[PDB]
Amino acid sequence: AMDVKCDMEVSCPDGYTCCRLQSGAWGCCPFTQAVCCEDHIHCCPAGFTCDTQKGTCEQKLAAALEHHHHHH
Numbered sequence: 001a002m003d004v005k006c007d008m009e010v011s012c013p014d015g016y017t018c019c020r021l022q023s024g025a026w027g028c029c030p031f032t033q034a035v036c037c038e039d040h041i042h043c044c045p046a047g048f049t050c051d052t053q054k055g056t057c058e059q060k061l062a063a064a065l066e067h068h069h070h071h072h
Contacts, residue, residue: 019043019055037063 001011006018012028019027019036021044029035029043036043036057037050044057051061062070 017043019057021045021057 001013003013004016004018005011006026006028010018010026010028012018012026012030015030015032017027017029017031017035019029021027027043029041031041033040034042034050034055036048036055042048042057048057048059049061049063050057051065053064053066
C-alpha cells in the first residue's frame with residue numbers, strides 16, 4: 001500500500017495514479033489508462049480536460065493539445 005506515493009500525505013500504490021487537484025493535494029486514480037483525461041474514469045472532478053499533453057485537468061480545452069492554431 002506504500003509502493004507508490006505522490007507526496008507526504010497521499011498513498012496511491014500499484015494500479016493507482018498520481019494526479020494534482022485544486023484540493024491543495026494529490027489524487028489517487030485506481031485505474032490504468034488515460035490519466036486525468038478522456039471519459040471513462042478521470043482523476044479530475046469532471047469539467048476538466050487534459051492539457052500539456054501529459055494529463056493536466058483544467059477546464060475544457062481540447063484534450064492532448066499537439067497543435068498551435070485552431071478555430072472553434
